[PDB]
Amino acid sequence: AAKDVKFGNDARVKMLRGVNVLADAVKVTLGPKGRNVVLDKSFGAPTITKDGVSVAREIELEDKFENMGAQMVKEVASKANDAAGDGTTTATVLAQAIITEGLKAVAAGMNPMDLKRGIDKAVTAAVEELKALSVPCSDSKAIAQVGTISANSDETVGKLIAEAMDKVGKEGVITVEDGTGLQDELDVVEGMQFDRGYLSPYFINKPETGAVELESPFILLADKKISNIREMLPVLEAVAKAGKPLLIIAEDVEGEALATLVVNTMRGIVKVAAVKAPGFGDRRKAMLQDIATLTGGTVISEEIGMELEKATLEDLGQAKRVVINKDTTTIIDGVGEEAAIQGRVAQIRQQIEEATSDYDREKLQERVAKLAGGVAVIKVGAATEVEMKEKKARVEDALHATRAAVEEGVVAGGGVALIRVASKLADLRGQNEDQNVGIKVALRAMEAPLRQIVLNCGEEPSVVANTVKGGDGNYGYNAATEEYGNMIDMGILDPTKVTRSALQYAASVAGLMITTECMVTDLP
Template identity: 65%
Template sequence: MAKQLVFSEDARTRLKRGIDKVAFAVATTLGPKGRNVALDKKWGAPTITHDGVSVAKEIELEDPFENMGAQLLKEAATKTNDIAGDGTTTATVLAHTMVTEGLKNVAAGANPMLLKRGIEAAAEKASQAILDQAIDIETKEEIANVAAISAQDREIGELIAEVMDKVGKDGVITVEEGKGLGFETEYVEGMQFDRGYISPYFITNPETLEAVIEEPYILIHEKKISAAQDLVPLLEKLLNRGKRELVIIAEDVDGEALATLVLNKLRGMLNVLAVKAPGFGDRRKAMLRDIAVLTGGTVISEELGRKLENVTIEDLGRADKVVATKNDTTIVGGHGDEEAIKGRMEEIRVEIEKSTSDYDREKLQERLAKLAGGVAVIKVGAGTEVELKEKKHRVEDALSATRAAVEEGIVPGGGVALINAISSLDDVEMEYPDEQTGVKIVRTALEAPMR
């Protein structure tokens, strides 16, 4: 397909038209008095939203150059959403004002590169001024207020405050669609991972189809266990001590080894449970180390020169209870050393800070929450599909806003914090007049949300 080319003022004008269209559509959702926007779908019911980035993502313009401008402004909203999870409308309004003022000055003959330099210097100064205004929030009531303002719903605010209070700041809270009409919350006690029992013969409760073992020893093995003779020495050591409860976490247990465990279970010799290890590759190794730290055990790995036949009872972890279903396993009350658990959590926090991948960061945060024992699910219910999606979206936005507030504090809303930051730009000294114009552009942009 042949490429279309436009230059200079014509190019800027057409890009600006696309930017304007996105900005005007998104700006209607600004603040607590912002309007809702209905988004048409090719299939299914329309979506009602109050979220700037959701509106921006739906906009595709017919003119390719206008569409290019629209995509550029979308990027500002999307990036803000990725980092903070909310505040996308404000980011769009600020970006739009800077583009509008910048293009005016370029048309009047200003040097675009010098304008950019001035804008960047002023934006950095204003960002620091906003951070300096931040007030830490700690109490449950303050958290409820932040969430309620974001969601425009007191019930959602109090629900999020309650959940965050229970799971702690390192906890993971997921939002799902529920079956009822209201909100439901589920808390996962202990460390849970998404792998279940290897054989239904391990089930102890036929009604719930669960395998529950109280006060078990826990063998954590990195590889597959197939040979019975590898397991027999450990089983004998346990029986000699009068211990019958054993949980095996391994890549897989099959063949003679599985037959031996099932036979001993059915005969009542051992109360045993074998579950598959979570994750894959390096992530599996890391998660097994987490389980080892939590339970006070050791990961049996040939890489570390450890063989299954040489395992001692001291290498096994301990827990108050292990519950396994077909799809997941929960370890409750691990007997690991408190200091070792804190050290492991600190290691994961450092990894989170260094990680450049959103996916890796999310998985690390999940591991941190599991070690801290803080995992919760909020189930959102509603009368219709449209209402359900809109409500779920508000809960997700409120959750993101609240997390950001707990992490970095809060500032006055309604554009007041941005107005207060304007005075900090008085200290920005630039060498060239066009750079100083860039600073003035940021000054104008900071006033835009208030208007």
């Protein structure tokens, strides 16, 4: 495939327009008072939305190059969200702010390598400044606090989170299920979560979480790499007959059998999903065994002479729910009995005594943890189906901002934190006057979100900006009610993780771009 190669300036101009269209389509929705974007949808009526994550998802441009530009910002802003639970839009809005101004500089004939330096200093400095502005959130009170604000003034959501953390810890795995009454419920239950993701996006059955949700599934616990669907066909037949879904947790599932199970849930003949097993090498076989004990399944280890051709249902583990992500598997309520699960903890307990190294220690206690520690399920209750799966939605939003708040604290939510940290480090210098420009581009990028919220509301940016700058700490403008005040007091706050991630991620791609000299792609 013959490529099209663009250089230096051309490449960057293309890149820049690419980035603007993403940003101009996505930024108009930022405030509590955003504007609508209309997103056409093949059959039927268009979609009107104010949700930048949805607008972004749709953005792909004709011009390759221009497109690469937009895809690159999308990429990085989505990781912001990946690591924080929010900021996707903010990240984009900021990414445009640096990229615009940094990229004009380079084009004016200033030094790229310095501009990046400058930006990266300004970011470094403001991330610190944020740590300073940041107020911790640690106690049950504070937890329910950020929870309730994050779930929109609903004090019951704040409570349920507070309560869950209170039961399985600020680590403990907490999930949400659809509720069965009008009552909320909180139950702790045998289960576990481990850091491995689906092996193919096509497993997803609920595209709004971009996640796979299997109900009452059997669990295959194979200790080997699964290559051929041949080995499978006795087990997938027993499973199809029990009319239940199935989770494969094997060393891996490769090409053939993978693309097979993929097209097997595409037409919906048997709903299935597979994920790699937790950990590697020596501590894998132990860890797989743990999930066995948890779900009362039999581990099929080729190192004792058992094929998957010799496996009936009786071998498969079983849990009342499982939910997989891009990068997480979480098994909820495992049927494996407490006679066993406790016995195993008693085994592992002892292995800690016969530990002679520290790395051999933590690794055994992360195992005792996952297993005896459990999974806390919140059932969201409500009056109507609509309410319910709306409330269920905000409960996951809050849980997200809270997990986040715990880790790094909260700050002024209206853009305000960024506006603030910027007016503090308005002496900053570098050595090159090129590095200064870099610092200033970065600094003035930091007002972008506030300026944007204001704008979207149809008030004046410059004026609200200038008055937010004039104050201190968490004084800000609350665009929803048009009052100035203490943004935190007035219930407008961002987790510290999320404002920072946003900024870091925006700065990363901007630097990347200010230092791109060449762009390869296919022929129109």
